[PDB]
Amino acid sequence: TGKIVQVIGAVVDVEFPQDAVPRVYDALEVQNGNERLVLEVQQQLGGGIVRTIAMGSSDGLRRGLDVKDLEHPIEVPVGKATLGRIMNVLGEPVDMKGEIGEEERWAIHRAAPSYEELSNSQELLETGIKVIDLMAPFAKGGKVGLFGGAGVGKTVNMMELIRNIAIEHSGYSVFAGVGERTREGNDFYHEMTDSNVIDKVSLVYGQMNEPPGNRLRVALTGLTMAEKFRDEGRDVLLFVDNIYRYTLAGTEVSALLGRMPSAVGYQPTLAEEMGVLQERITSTKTGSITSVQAVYVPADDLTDPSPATTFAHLDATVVLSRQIASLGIYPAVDPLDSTSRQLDPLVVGQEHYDTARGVQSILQRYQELKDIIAILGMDELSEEDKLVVARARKIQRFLSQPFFVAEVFTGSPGKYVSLKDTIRGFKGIMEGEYDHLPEQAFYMVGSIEEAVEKAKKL
Amino acid sequence: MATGKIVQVIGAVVDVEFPQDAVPRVYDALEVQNGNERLVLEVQQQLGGGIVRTIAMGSSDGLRRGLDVKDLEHPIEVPVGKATLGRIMNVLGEPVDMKGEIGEEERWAIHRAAPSYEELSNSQELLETGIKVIDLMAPFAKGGKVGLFGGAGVGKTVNMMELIRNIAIEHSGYSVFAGVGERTREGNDFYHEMTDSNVIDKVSLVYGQMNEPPGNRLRVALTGLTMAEKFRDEGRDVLLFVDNIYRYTLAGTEVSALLGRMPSAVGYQPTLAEEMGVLQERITSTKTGSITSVQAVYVPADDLTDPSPATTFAHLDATVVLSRQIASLGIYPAVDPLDSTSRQLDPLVVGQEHYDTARGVQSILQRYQELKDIIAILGMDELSEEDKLVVARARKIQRFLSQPFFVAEVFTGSPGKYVSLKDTIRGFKGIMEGEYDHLPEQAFYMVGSIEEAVEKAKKL
Amino acid sequence: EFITVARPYAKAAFDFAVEHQSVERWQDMLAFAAEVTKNEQMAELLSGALAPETLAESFIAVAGEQLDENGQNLIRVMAENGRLNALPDVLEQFIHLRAVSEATAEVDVISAAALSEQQLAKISAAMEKRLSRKVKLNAKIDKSVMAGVIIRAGDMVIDGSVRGRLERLADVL
Amino acid sequence: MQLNSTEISELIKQRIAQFNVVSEAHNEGTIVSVSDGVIRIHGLADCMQGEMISLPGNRYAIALNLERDSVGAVVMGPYADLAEGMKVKCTGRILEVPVGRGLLGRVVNTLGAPIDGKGPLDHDGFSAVEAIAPGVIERQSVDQPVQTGYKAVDSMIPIGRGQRELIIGDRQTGKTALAIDAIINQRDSGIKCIYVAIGQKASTISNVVRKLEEHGALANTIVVVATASESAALQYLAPYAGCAMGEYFRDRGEDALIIYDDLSKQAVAYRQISLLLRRPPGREAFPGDVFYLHSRLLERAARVNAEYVEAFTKGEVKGKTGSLTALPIIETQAGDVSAFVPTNVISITDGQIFLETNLFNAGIRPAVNPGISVSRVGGAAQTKIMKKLSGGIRTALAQYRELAAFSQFASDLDDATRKQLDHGQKVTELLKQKQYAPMSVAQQSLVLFAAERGYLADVELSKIGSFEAALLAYVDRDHAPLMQEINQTGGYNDEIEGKLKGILDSFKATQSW
Amino acid sequence: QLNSTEISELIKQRIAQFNVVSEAHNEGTIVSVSDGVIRIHGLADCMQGEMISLPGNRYAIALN
Amino acid sequence: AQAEIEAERKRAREELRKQVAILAVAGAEKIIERSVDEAANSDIVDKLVAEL
Amino acid sequence: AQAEIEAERKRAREELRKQVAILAVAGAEKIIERSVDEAANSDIVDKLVAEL
């Protein structure tokens, strides 16, 4: 009952009778050759025209085709039936099994929970990772974000967190792959299915090959599946593989939607697009969502508008850096930029808090000397400041750890380090009780015991 | 018969409207009577409705609206061939010197396609310039591009004149000098420095200088190149000098801004790499002949990352940088052996003996460069005896890179020398293999071959 | 070029002319308006920046072949939007919408030489089947084409000419 | 003899016989504008986005925009001779490229037109240039190895069939060399190869073709070329043509390898095409979708499971798995590994080989910089023997290279750091290798054996070269069977370890090098 | 050359009578909706900063 | 050397086929313009209208 | 071998001069199904035979 009138890249304009124009976010349908193409309207231009985004390949569309108005928004399968299966942005099953026997379908556009319904939790969550749970401990039901450039470890860290908390966790889990490699999605699907945990994970995948609209709405499609388990009374884990692609897909489409560019070419509505998503991924009195989000920062510029506007939406922020990863120090967390809302004397105890702050102080004091060391050499440093440097370097190395998911790279077996066991090692290194041991005794060891043991072999 | 009419005039951009079926094709030339003299317009774009947008190859002041425009059915065409040697011409191939008409018989369009894939030479030769420093440390490929990054007061013009002389005499090739966007004073004194050394009859000059509208500075390089191509088709080996490729980039930036196109990397036109490529991809060695090119390059803001140098260096094969220092010591030519580079220096192309001789002298000089600082601070006799020998050989090599030009006789008085490559390799292997340690460093200075250094030491 | 800005006005004028069964009067009124735009003096006036409601009135003055309300009103609206120069195209799209509504087409026939007027009859009869429209023919003669015929129906062409066959064979090889 | 005039005449005769004379109805439009290679066509009520529009001459144009009243298109060739008013014909074809195994050994334009003089193509139909890569369920984990000729990358940075491995570095550091040395090495391993050159000089391409012919590899490679002089619409569309030619092998259960000569110049040509359409630019003036440009390209280099190969080929091929391996090359200014486009492609591929200029100027070639180059498929793609001997060798060299930074002045612990330094130094002196000298997995393996089981402390930095030359000649002379065995299998066992130790002591003692 | 909310049926109304009824100075009609901005046709007596009341219980601020 | 011998064989074969191909169509054109008349025009027009 | 290929080329060209006149007629008759006589074309076919 409508005609196409323009096809610019990924956006399509459709003309309808004045009295039947669809509403915003309703879904239309066309026939692109043999296939059926779903459009989602973004704007109601004047005169019955409506401007839409194609959820599929836009090639092959002529003008004047006839499009049908489906009178409901995009709706996805939801609930228990969607568990252990892979789905499109449109909720269609993408593994070669049959239909999803869903009893209910939910619109992917929803309002965030009211302020009255929110809930706050001080219950610490423990992970096997030294640096994360010393510098930036995070709590059940809270948001976590791994900030880093390209190729620094923010996917390997997310797979390690999945390993350490997701298998030892009762409730279900949801994994949304937003604009990342299909290879990694296949690898993760098969690793899960081979350990029989797949029947606890729901997967959504709008990987990098797909046109902008799929990457644009796949994140919402995942949040809906998560919100369902939350409202059912359960507690959920939500892993988003790269939330930067959700805004990159908005930037790709913005100019075609006829909107004046902004700070660095970004859409004028960047902060609202980002908030309208991250405000509904929260825990509430009727259930809790625990979420880990990888956040790519373009060109390693931590001040680009997209990371800068994301920082405000996370409780614990872990900032990876290339200058550390280039030292072979994995994980490459930058201890002088990672933080957590949960690092307070009240929440984590005076001993943990004090050790974390001492480590920060030492590493910063070492940063301040790095230029005088560069120009004048290390022999000009006062004897007090040469001890600071050696302890700083020992601490730099002791934050490294082997991961079970990185055996494929280094061959060394992974390690799981309890919190009680790491604050002790750092208290020791700082207080000086290990101040007679070569630095390389600390590279890639689990606990301080293993370091004093490795020193025997040099 | 004229058919168009000027409809807009804005700076150097003029719009003319033709009948709907007679719209000129892009790059076609048009002409108008700008008062008492004709003016040539080059088409840049076709807007809808029979309107076409052009750039004036001349000062556009005095242009009314509605003037009749005659549509030449061909691009700008220039005279080519032997007839243009020793003349001076502007972008439109008009004799700009006052010695009258050019007596050519054939005229070529300046817009052309690069040689197809299967016209290119299925070999890789070298060009024997005849200068020791270049032939050793920065050999030229026949049909390649050579950047010349020297500054001022170092002899760029006399190096160019020596290359012109040698490539006319010791080969049978001519030369073309395109004066893209540089001072008029240097053009006039270059014309004279060449007329009084008898090389003017061996070079064809085309000048579009800083005092010209943007279109002239843009297309002058194509004029020079399309004369060099005519010389190539005769089977010759030709040499093409560009006075500054950076100004050929900047004229295109000005024009692109005039046309209103969106800016790109750091202020440049969006078509920077294609404008540079369609030029640099026409000077290649064809199965019939070859055009070699020596191009002066200016790096903005001392940045080798700026889009213009970064785009140019994609095409340069060799690179010779002139140094004020090496001149101050008195060594002429003033090439810097440590900064001059060439991607022809590989055993697989130049051979193992030439490659390792060049690498030898390079290592010798780059050690001497710091033994001399150790001397400057601690005094001479602090050195080791091995190092004193290194210094004593480095000084000799450094002296032997001088040469007397046929063009420099008017300064040195000594007769100019043309040194074949074999002789330079022999001389430097000898000086580096410990031969000739028995004669003084001033026996090598400004000599020529080593077989003349021995004779100069004989009489010293 | 006003191909796009003329569409709303042509559509509105045609929908109005239908409600009142005056399509022929509207078409002639528009054909007169589009000629008032081409006069040498009026084209000067339309360019200089006059206030829309005085430009519209001086335009209405030069036309007494426009019916009192509805032509004058169309001119006033286009003048308010500053689009009086679009009339020559409003006319073309009005003629097009009319041809579509009355189910008519006008197909060109290009030949090496005039046809037999039985050939023309068969061509019209065949096209009136290819297209639901009653089709006019306006045969034209070109001699670059040398045998066969070209049938052009809007933006649809049937390259029956032998010249087409030659150019289409040369590029097979 | 073989210039059979009767053969030419029969060819043309078959063509004239295999003709179609019946007329056909097509849709027409008119060019309204021409500027900087972009065209504006009025009409074509029935054009579809992505279509091929046919222009006067035999050139083509691609439809990018279907505006309300006009079609925007870019000319795939020289546009200067087009003029307003010319008619254009809408072919019912989305952008398509000849594909087949008959293209092997040809040099081809981005539109599939052969630019070498050797006449028309033999090809198995046409493939769409723009396609969506296989889904997540259709992939399979990369298992098999792809052997280059170089100890450095085959040991530290393995490449598996189906991987995508960025070769990144500065200008004149050996990228093209490292890539065509991987192309030459597949001469006998059954992996068809494709080499696409975007924005390169014509002289360089002619030279590279002459080398591919000099080593016999050309009969196994397709060359897709868009030189620096060609339109920005051929440069931008070339790598998609090359990937469409490689997917032909991928989808039939075979193996292929494709090299994009500069995906930095593809980005520049796309930036040109985008700015000429007045599209708001982003960082470094690149468009918004400069990531999607490389994403939808490199995501096609995939490995597919046997069910995808069956379903695609209508069941003609059972049990096999196809793969397309990609080696994109990127150029970075001043070694700046943190610009925009370099970082995008590092974020799209499965690893990077980072060629550093300080090493290249120091005579270390291939100048692989350990510590910045990784292979995210890790050892799964190595042969068993290589995976064993190599181990953490790369992080070992990274440690050695950083230690050299501080030990430059002075060091303590100065016997263990001393032996560490000597070992690492001899290893770097052993990893450098000459151009065009590939060495089988057997030779790399036994040389790494000699490297790791001591056996090299005594021989000097001056002799490493000689040690290797002798070692390999000796083993070629005597233990030809053991080489024939290690080359046929992953070949690791305590039996083979003992055989290697025996050869090592034999050569070490009785041979004098 | 681009349109300014000159659309078919509004133009047709103006053809019907140029001097349209002025009673509705207090109300108007939404013609566009996007990203949280709406264009309203009419409202001849709207004042800058005024509050405009939409269907339901919602308001908008007239800025342009 | 053998490789280039074979490639030049291929290239000369193609070079010759090209000339044969272009001259075939130029001859066909001249023959047609030399041989068409009312009968052939009427035949072509009738045969295309019969399938129009 | 190249100087052998040149002789091969002349040898085959002189033969293909006979085939141009066949292919031109075959094409002309394929494009217009009205058969054509050699007689009236015997002259213009000769220019093709000559110029190859």
Ligand SMILES: Nc1ncnc2c1ncn2[C@@H]1O[C@H](COP(=O)(O)OP(=O)(O)OP(=O)(O)O)[C@@H](O)[C@H]1O
């Ligand atoms: N392993 C090696 N040993 C010695 N020389 C080498 C080696 N690899 C490359 N080279 C030399 O480096 C030179 C340039 O290398 P190459 O052209 O492959 O780099 P590139 O990055 O492709 O250059 P460009 O970026 O200009 O294309 C070559 O001429 C070659 O001689």
Ligand SMILES: Nc1ncnc2c1ncn2[C@@H]1O[C@H](COP(=O)(O)OP(=O)(O)O)[C@@H](O)[C@H]1O
């Ligand atoms: N714990 C670790 N041990 C070894 N390598 C690691 C570790 N963590 C990360 N890496 C390295 O990080 C590199 C980048 O991988 P990845 O995390 O997928 O990049 P991205 O940040 O884009 O996801 C890998 O190739 C791997 O070698």
Ligand SMILES: Nc1ncnc2c1ncn2[C@@H]1O[C@H](COP(=O)(O)OP(=O)(O)O)[C@@H](O)[C@H]1O
């Ligand atoms: N081969 C040479 N022999 C003697 N003198 C030279 C030689 N080359 C350059 N010079 C001197 O160097 C000076 C630089 O002059 P000039 O070439 O005009 O400057 P520039 O090259 O910067 O234009 C000249 O005055 C000339 O005397």
Ligand SMILES: [Mg+2]
């Ligand atoms: Mg990742």
Ligand SMILES: [Mg+2]
């Ligand atoms: Mg290269």
